[PDB]
Amino acid sequence: MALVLDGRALAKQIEENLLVRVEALKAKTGRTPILATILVGDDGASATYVRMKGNACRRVGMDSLKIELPQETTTEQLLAEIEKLNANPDVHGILLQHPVPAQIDERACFDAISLAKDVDGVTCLGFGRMAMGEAAYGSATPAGIMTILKENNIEIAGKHAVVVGRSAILGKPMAMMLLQANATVTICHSRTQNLPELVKQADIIVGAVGKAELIQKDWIKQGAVVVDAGFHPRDGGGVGDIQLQGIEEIASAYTPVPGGVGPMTITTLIRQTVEAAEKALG
Amino acid sequence: MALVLDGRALAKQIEENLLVRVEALKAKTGRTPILATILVGDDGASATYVRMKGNACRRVGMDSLKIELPQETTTEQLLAEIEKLNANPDVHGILLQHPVPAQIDERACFDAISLAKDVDGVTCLGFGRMAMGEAAYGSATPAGIMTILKENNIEIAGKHAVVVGRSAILGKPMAMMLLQANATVTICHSRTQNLPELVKQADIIVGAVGKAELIQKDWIKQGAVVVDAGFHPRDGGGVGDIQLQGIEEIASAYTPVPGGVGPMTITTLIRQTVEAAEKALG
Ligand SMILES: Nc1nc(O)c2c(n1)NC[C@@H]1CN(c3ccc(C(=O)N[C@@H](CCC(=O)O)C(=O)O)cc3)C(=O)N21
Ligand SMILES: Nc1nc(O)c2c(n1)NC[C@@H]1CN(c3ccc(C(=O)N[C@@H](CCC(=O)O)C(=O)O)cc3)C(=O)N21
Ligand SMILES: [Cl-]
Numbered sequence A, B: 001m002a003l004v005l006d007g008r009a010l011a012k013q014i015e016e017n018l019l020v021r022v023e024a025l026k027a028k029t030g031r032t033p034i035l036a037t038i039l040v041g042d043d044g045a046s047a048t049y050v051r052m053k054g055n056a057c058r059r060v061g062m063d064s065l066k067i068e069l070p071q072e073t074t075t076e077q078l079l080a081e082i083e084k085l086n087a088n089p090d091v092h093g094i095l096l097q098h099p100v101p102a103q104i105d106e107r108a109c110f111d112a113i114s115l116a117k118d119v120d121g122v123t124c125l126g127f128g129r130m131a132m133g134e135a136a137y138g139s140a141t142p143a144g145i146m147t148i149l150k151e152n153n154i155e156i157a158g159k160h161a162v163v164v165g166r167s168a169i170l171g172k173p174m175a176m177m178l179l180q181a182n183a184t185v186t187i188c189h190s191r192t193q194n195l196p197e198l199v200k201q202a203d204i205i206v207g208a209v210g211k212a213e214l215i216q217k218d219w220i221k222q223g224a225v226v227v228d229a230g231f232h233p234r235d236g237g238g239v240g241d242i243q244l245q246g247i248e249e250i251a252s253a254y255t256p257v258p259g260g261v262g263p264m265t266i267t268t269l270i271r272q273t274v275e276a277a278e279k280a281l282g
Helices: A007-029 A044-059 A075-087 A106-112 A124-131 A140-151 A171-180 A195-200 A261-280 B007-029 B044-059 B075-086 B106-112 B124-131 B140-151 B171-180 B195-200 B261-281
Strands: A034-040 A063-069 A093-096 A160-164 A184-188 A204-207 A225-228 B034-040 B063-069 B093-096 B160-164 B184-188 B204-207 B225-228
Touching (some): A007 A140, A007 A261, A034 A044, A044 A261, A184 A195, B007 B140, B007 B261, B034 B075, B075 B093, B093 B106, B124 B171, B140 B261, B160 B195, B171 B204
Parallel strands (some): A204 A225, B160 B204, B204 B225
């Protein structure tokens, strides 16, 4: 049977280390690390993930500054809020939960976040630096995925990694991170032809399409490493972007859904915020 | 049978209106657009390419500011020179010819160039912005290749593009630009295990390895679009990264070497300099 890539376990483990680090920092400086979380509008999943990220902050001994803005917020209004957080020395990281209301230029607002506080890794600057091997906080989910792979001793160098999806915060950074780790990388999307064949060639497959079980189990190469970055709620167990039923007979290793990529998304954000606080308060 | 993708003819065509634009800007403002070229050390090819770029500037009514620094220039020294040029209002674009001497952190120096003057498209910020679809000067060679494909009506959307090579100024930006044009993109490099297999599936193949005729003609798909971004001088006619002798029997369209990608590398830099000058002066 396939190795279960246990992101839930790894997240908890990482948080135990973060906790002692945060407590040491507070004891030395008297100051608490702070993630500013920006939630714009009433999207349910967005509310949930910000809630979970706030919880993660408190588990490791830090806190969050919760910024809640109405659905009708303008790009200019959100930019003003982000600049207030940039200029606040008490705020160490800034999260803008995506997707913001569609009238807002989300890209412009991402890029307004100062690099030093880009702990979710959403800036063009941060992306470009990461792609070219320079120090920068990585996009939360992709960086979480790399950590899962690394800490489970998964071979990446020389493997053919197929990333299905090319989103700004997930697919694109994932591809560039795998490339930096010396995988041959294929990037697919909605205009990709022969997707089943490309997926079948993959030694490592990353489902990042935001559509329930789009990647079919019979497309998966026998022995492949299967990363499912999706989540779609359902009665009696939610599912991701990949058909994972019976995956244990097919993959060499796989991330379960729930409890795989998800927990490591949140914990990666918090770890990078601790790093930012450690730097800022050191 | 193949369509020759004539970069030399396209470069000449494009310069016609660039000259009109520059002469209009000069007549209107009384100021001459300047590209600052930085040549560090004794690389013969670098010197040759810098002169070609200086010549190209002058062909369209602009001028160059020739910065020549010694072989043993340090990172600190180069950075200081770039900051002088950033703060020079008479300089509208900055080129740092690669590869600088080994002791210099080239990435750090590329990134010191102000985005507004990054007309060669070498900054991490420029790369990330391009990758995320924000307006930015693109890396000269890749952007030139996209122009060649567009001007020759080459279908990109939905094609399987394979880019062999992943360098900062060529392979990586090439990959993202093709991705932006809705190709499915596979990025190969020195740790790719079955390079011939992958090249054989390429609808569009980009040779960006810097090794004479490494990409074999036997690997090319019948009807492929073939882009050779290499140049290696030989007695009575240099060769690129791809075996092109007899390529006309196999490719639907191909870039000759010489006279393909090269001319459009220079034209792209000059065009983006014209753009920078117009923005700065107009
Ligand atoms: N800026 C920004 N950064 C992010 O990193 C995110 C963002 N926007 N918007 C959506 C994605 C998705 N996402 C996220 C985070 C955690 C989980 C997670 O842990 N999910 C559980 C199942 C419960 C559920 O998803 O509601 C899991 O075990 O996978 C899922 C998505 C998240 O946090 N994302
Ligand atoms: N920063 C930076 N930007 C660039 O855009 C370049 C750089 N460094 N260093 C090397 C590459 C390669 N390069 C370049 C430019 C023009 C030509 C060219 O036009 N070559 C002729 C043949 C003559 C020859 O190559 O000596 C051709 O028709 O291809 C070849 C490489 C160039 O300008 N490059
Ligand atoms: Cl001339």
